[PDB]
Ligand binder design. Sequence first.
Ligand code: HEM
Ligand code: HEM
Ligand code: KMM
Ligand code: KMM
Ligand code: H4B
Ligand code: H4B
Ligand code: ZN
Lengths: 408, 413
Amino acid sequence: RFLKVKNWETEVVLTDTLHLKSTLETGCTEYICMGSIMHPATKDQLFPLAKEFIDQYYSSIKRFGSKAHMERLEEVNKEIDTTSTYQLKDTELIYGAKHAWRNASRCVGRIQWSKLQVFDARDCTTAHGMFNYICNHVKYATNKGNLRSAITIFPQRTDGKHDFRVWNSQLIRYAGYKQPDGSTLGDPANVQFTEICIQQGWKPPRGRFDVLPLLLQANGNDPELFQIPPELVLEVPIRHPKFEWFKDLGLKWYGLPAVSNMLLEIGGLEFSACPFSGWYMGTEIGVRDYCDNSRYNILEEVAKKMNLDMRKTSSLWKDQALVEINIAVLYSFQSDKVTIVDHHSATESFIKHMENEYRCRGGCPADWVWIVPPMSGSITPVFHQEMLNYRLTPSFEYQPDPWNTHVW
Amino acid sequence: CPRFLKVKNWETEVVLTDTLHLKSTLETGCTEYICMGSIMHPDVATKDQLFPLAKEFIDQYYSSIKRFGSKAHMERLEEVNKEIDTTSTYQLKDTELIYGAKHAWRNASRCVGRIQWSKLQVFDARDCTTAHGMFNYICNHVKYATNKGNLRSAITIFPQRTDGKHDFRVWNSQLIRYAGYKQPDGSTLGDPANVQFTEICIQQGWKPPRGRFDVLPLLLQANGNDPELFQIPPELVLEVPIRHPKFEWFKDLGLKWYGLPAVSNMLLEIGGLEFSACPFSGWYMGTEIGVRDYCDNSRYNILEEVAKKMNLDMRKTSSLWKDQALVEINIAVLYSFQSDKVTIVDHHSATESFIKHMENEYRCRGGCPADWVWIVPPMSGSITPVFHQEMLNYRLTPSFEYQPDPWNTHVWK
Ligand code: HEM
Ligand code: HEM
Ligand SMILES: Cc1cc(N)nc(CCc2c(F)c(F)cc(CCCN(C)C)c2F)c1
Ligand SMILES: Cc1cc(N)nc(CCc2c(F)c(F)cc(CCCN(C)C)c2F)c1
Ligand SMILES: C[C@H](O)[C@H](O)[C@H]1CNc2nc(N)[nH]c(=O)c2N1
Ligand SMILES: C[C@H](O)[C@H](O)[C@H]1CNc2nc(N)[nH]c(=O)c2N1
Ligand SMILES: [Zn+2]
C-alpha cells in the first residue's frame, strides 16, 4: 500500500511508494516496535542480490533490459559460478557507494549524497597500502578546511578469514586514558581502543588531545600501527565569541569526521573496510563529544566559569552551558573556515532533501530517533516531520569490533 | 516472537530484559519491513468480540490481587459472561474500574510521568446523565486536582459506550485551554492550536472576550445529545504569570499559563469496554509549556520577541539565538511555577525518575513499554538519561487511545 507522512508544523503530506522496494528487516513486528534499539555468503544467496543490484543500476542509467544489461547479468552469473563471488565495475562501485549514503536512514546530511568522491582501493594488499590510501583520503577530504565528502573502498570480503579492517572507529579520534585514581584522561569512549594501541606498542603522550594512530588489518593479517602525518590532521581551537575565558579551557577538536568501522554492502558483496567522511554538524562535537556523561563531560566546568547556580537542576544550568558550548564550536570552525553546519541549517536541508526524494524517488527512509538533533529538538523542523524507516540496499551496516573475532 | 528481549542503556551499560511484551495486544503500525515509530497516529464490540476481552481483563485483575483461580474469580467470570449474553455488554465493579484506569496510565508508552501511576484518584461518574451533571463532575475534578497548587493526579470516568449513538464526550481537547482567534489579516490572537475549537464554541453561542489568554468554555455531550456550553468558574482555574529570575523585562511580555494539564479527548479501554469521556490530569513538565506551547512556530511563537529583548543577533542561525532564548523561557516557566508553589517538574528530574521507574517495572513487571520519540524531551535531549536508553514500544491493555473529534462524527439532533 501507499503510505503517507505528515509534517505537523506545515501540514505537508508526502506519499511513500519507495518502501515497497525494501527487503532487509527493520526488527519491528506488528506487535513490538524496536525503533530506539541501536542494533536489533554463497553462490546461491549471491546471484539474486547481484541481479537486483545490477537491475537497479541499469534501471538508474535507463538502459534496463539493454544488451549491456543482459550481458552484464550473464557476465556476473558466470563469474559467481566459477569463483563464488564477483567484482563490481568501476561505474557500479561508484553508484553503489553513493546509494549506500542516499539510503542511510540515520544520516541528516544526505542532501549531499551524489557529491561523494569515491576512491577505489580494491587493489590494496597490505596495511602499508591501506595507510597510503587513507592518508590520500584524509588529505583530499580535508582540502585545507574546505571539506569534501569521500569514501575509500578496500577489497571485499572473501571467506571471512581475510578481511580488510580499519580497527579505529574513526580515522581521526583522541585517545582516552584510564587513570590510576579512577577517572579518565582524554576521550573516555576510546579507552579500550587506546589500550589496544598501547598493547601493540604505541607510545602514548598521555595528553588530553592525543591523535590515535591508525591500526590497520589487511587480508586478515595482524593489524599494524601507523601515525597519520600531523600536517594532514586539521584541528580547531575552540573559543567563544563573548566569553574570552573560554579559550583557557584548553579545548580543541579535529575538523574531519570519518567513520571507519562500518560495512558497505553492494549487490551482496561485503566491503568490511570502507572509511567515509564528510563534515560535522556542530552538535556532534558540542553536545555528544563534550557533554555526554561518558564522554568529555565538561558541562560542570563551563557552568562554573559562567557562574551559574548548579545546586538544583531546575535552574537549567546544564541547558545554559550546553548552548554556549555549541555556540563556541560553530564560531571556532567558521572563524577558521573549516566546513561545519549548525543543526538548524542541517535539519532544514534535510526537510528539503526529503521533499526532493519523495518527488523524484517516491520516498526517503529516515530514522527520526537519529535525525532529530540531540539539543533543541522541537525548534528544528525534523522534530515535526513524520518519517518512515525501512532498509534499502546498497547500505552501510554495523559489524563486530575486530578485536572480538581476530585470531593472531 | 522471542521470549526475552534485551534493552541497553548506552551511557550506563545497564541491560534490562523484557518479557512483558508477550502480553502485547493491538498493533503498533510497524511491520517486519517498515517502522512507523515516528507516525503520530498509526460501531461497537459484538457479544463474541467482548467475551474474550473481558475474560482477559478479569483474569488480569484477579491475578493482580493474588486471587487468580479463586471462587470469587470464577464467579466474577460467570457473572460477566451471563451479563454479556443477556445484555451484549457488562458493568465493571468499582475495584475493577480503579484498577483499569490506573493500568491504562501505567501502560501509556508515551508518558514520562508514569512513576506516579499508582497514586491516581479515580472519580466514578458512571451515574451521570446530563451535560450539567458532567459540568458538576468536571468542576469537582478540577478543584480536587488543583488543590491550591499542590496538584494531585486524577481521572473522572463517565458512562461507557453502548450503541455508539449515545456517547458521552468532552469536546474540549483539554479541560483548560486558551482560545485562538483567526484575524481577517491572517494573524492569530491567542493560541493558534485552538482556533478550530474556538470557532465551534463561538458558533455554539460563546461570547468571546477576544483576548490573548481566554479560558475556553467546556463543551459537554451527554448520552449522545447535542453538546452544551459551560463556563468554568474562574476561581477554579489556577494560573501562573511568567517572570524571569534575572530579566526584569520578562514579565512585561504579559505571558501566563494555567497550572493544570488535563487531557479530555482520549478514550479509555478497559476489558473491551469503551469510556469515551474520561478526562485525566496530572502536573506539567516545564518543557510542555516553555518549549512546545510557547516556542512552537504554530503556537505562541515567542522566540523572536524574547530574542529581541535579549538583544541577540537573529541573522545567522549559527549564533543559536533560538536555542539561547528557548532556555531562558524554560528557566522563567520553572521559576514562576515554583515561586507560586504550583507543582511542576523540570525535564532533568522527570526523565531521571522515569529511568528509575522503568528499571523497577522491568524488575517487578517484566517490562515497561515506552515510546522514545515522546519520552525524550523537546530540548536538550541527549543530556537527559532517557536519550541513551533503548526502549521497547508495544500496546498493553487497559489503554488510553485516540478517538475521532466529535464534531466530525456527531449526528446533530
Ligand atoms: C556531508 C556531511 C555530513 C553530515 C553533516 C552528516 C551528518 C550526520 C550526523 C549528524 C549523523 C549522526 C551521527 C551520530 O549521531 O553518531 C550521521 C550519521 C550517518 N551518516 Fe552522515 N553526515 C555527512 C556525511 C556522510 C557521508 C559522506 C556518509 C557515507 C558516505 C554518511 C553516512 C552516514 C551513516 C551510515 C550514518 C549512520 C551511522 C550509524 O548508524 O551509526 N554521512 N550523519
Ligand atoms: C503526574 C504527572 C504527569 C506528568 C509529568 C506527565 C508527563 C507527560 C508528558 C511530558 C507527556 C508528553 C506530553 C506532550 O508532549 O503532549 C505525557 C503524555 C501522556 N500522559 Fe502523562 N504525565 C502526567 C500524568 C499523567 C496521567 C495522570 C495520565 C493518565 C491517567 C497520563 C497519561 C498520559 C498519556 C496517555 C499521554 C500520551 C498522550 C498522547 O499521546 O497524546 N499522564 N505525559
Ligand atoms: C561521514 C559523517 C559525517 C558526520 N558529520 N558525522 C558522521 C557520524 C560520526 C559518527 C558515527 F557515524 C558513528 F557511528 C558514531 C559516532 C560516535 C562519536 C565518535 N566521535 C567522538 C569521534 C560518530 F561521531 C559521519
Ligand atoms: C495528564 C497530563 C500531564 C502532563 N504533564 N501532560 C500531559 C499531556 C499533555 C497533552 C497531550 F498528551 C495531548 F495529547 C494533547 C494536549 C493538548 C495540546 C498539547 N499542547 C499542544 C498544548 C496535551 F496538553 C497530560
Ligand atoms: C512527527 C513526530 O512524531 C511528532 O512531531 C511528535 C514527535 N515527538 C513528540 N513528543 C512529545 N512528547 N510530544 C509531541 O507532540 C511529539 N510530537
Ligand atoms: C537509545 C537510543 O537509540 C540511542 O541513545 C540513540 C538515540 N538517538 C541517537 N541519535 C544520534 N544522532 N546519535 C546517537 O548516538 C543516538 N543514540
Ligand atoms: Zn517500529
